[PDB]
Each structure stands twice: as C-alpha cells, then as structure tokens.
Amino acid sequence: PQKICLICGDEASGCHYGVLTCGSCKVFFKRAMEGQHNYLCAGRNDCIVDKIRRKNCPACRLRKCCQAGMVLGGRK
Amino acid sequence: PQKICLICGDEASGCHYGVLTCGSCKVFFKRAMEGQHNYLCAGRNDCIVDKIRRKNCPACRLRKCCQAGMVLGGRKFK
DNA sequence: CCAGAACAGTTTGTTCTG
DNA sequence: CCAGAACAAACTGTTCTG
Ligand SMILES: [Zn+2]
Ligand SMILES: [Zn+2]
Ligand SMILES: [Zn+2]
Ligand SMILES: [Zn+2]
Fold first, then answer.
1. Residue A36 needs a FRET pair 20 to 30 A away by CA distance; which of A57, B14, B33, B43 works?
2. Closest chain B residue to the Cα of A53, Cα to Cα
3. Which residue spans match zinc fingers labelled NR C4-type (chain B)?
4. Count of domains in chain B?
C-alpha cells in the first residue's frame, strides 16, 4: 500500500533511530540532536509538520521526532 | 545609527519596495510575490519574524512584508 | 540610491557504502 | 535493511550592474 513517515507524512524509507520515517526526517533528526542549534518555535509549538512544510519549524519537527520515539544511537 | 529591517530586525541595507529592509527580505518579497507558491502558515498566521527564524515561515514573513507597506514595482524615477 | 541580475553560501534531502 | 557518509538539488542571502 505505502509506508508513511510518522513525522511528516512523506513516504517512509524504513525504520530509522526506532521509528518509521522518511529519508529527510532521518538526517534531520541526526543533525538536530547532534549540533546544538537550540531551535525555538517562532509560533506556539503548535506547527503542523507535513511533507511540504517540514523544514519550516525545526523545533516542532524535532519535538515530533522525540515524541514518536526516535533515539540516537550508531548501528545496533 | 544602525538601520533596522522592519520585517526581520536584521541590519537594513536601504529602502526597498517602499520600506526599510535588509537585502534578504527584499529578495524574499520579490521571489514570494512572483513565485508559484501561496505559502500556508503551519502555525496560526502569527509567527515571529526575526533574524534567526525569518526563513522558518514564508507565509508570515510575506504577510509582514505586505502589512509593512512593501509593494511590487519596477525601477521608478524621481 | 535601489531594482533586478548574477553570483555564492547555506540548508535540506537522496544516493552511495559498509 | 539501516547508519552514516558522500553527493546533490533546492533555497536563502550577498555582491554586482544599470
Ligand atoms: Zn518525514
Ligand atoms: Zn513550531
Ligand atoms: Zn529583513
Ligand atoms: Zn506562520
């Protein structure tokens, strides 16, 4: 039918850092946790994270990753 | 003495399309108005437009541009 | 000076590799 | 199959031109 990324609703590529996600949320999460960016939502931590706008709010996209269960860790 | 962009609060470069802006807002405004995309704010049409985050929500940045008085035009003469 | 164009750096996303 | 690396397209911002 089609695997859907639990972060953004794009087509998922596989189970990454614990969660069914697309390729972009995969690198995103990795890059976000890794560098210290201190991302702050410019709205109210409310943002819809979807395919077209996922890059809009890194704070909300990262928060969604963390709530979906994504966890850092290199090749289990 | 430093001139402040009225859209994002960065340092302003001049008066562009009718208001005090930085060069990034200047082009953003023209690209946005001429592009094929009517941006949909993923929040509440409320977003803060400041230097670090101006890129975050093009819908709200464009809204802020238009509300500030920015208007498309060609190269006008005095 | 400022709009538009051209150029350039930054960012996000996709394909390659072990 | 999946992390991480290498690659690449897309997007945002800066310097050049009339
Ligand atoms: Zn995704
Ligand atoms: Zn947000
Ligand atoms: Zn600005
Ligand atoms: Zn917004």
1. B43
2. B42
3. 5-25, 41-65
4. 1
- Which method was used? X-ray
Option in A43, A57, A60 nearest B44 (CB): A43
The answer to whether the beta carbons of residues A12 and A3 sit under 8 Å apart is: yes
**Tokens 């509300």 sit on residue:** B67
- Here the CATH number for the domain that contains residue A75 is 3.30.50.10
Residue A54 CA to residue A56 CA, distance in Å, equals: 5
Residues of A whose CB is below 8 A from B41: 43
Query: Cα(B69)–Cα(B36) distance, rounded to whole angstroms?
Result: 22
Please tell me which residue lies nearest to nucleotide C5, judged from CA to C1'.
B27
The residue segments making up the domain with residue A67 are: 1-76
| Nucleotide C8 C1' to residue A71 CA (A) | 36
Resolution value in angstroms:
2.5
Cα of A44 vs centre of ligand 1, distance in Å, is: 21
Structure tokens belonging to residue B13: 């470069």
B46 DSSP assignment: -
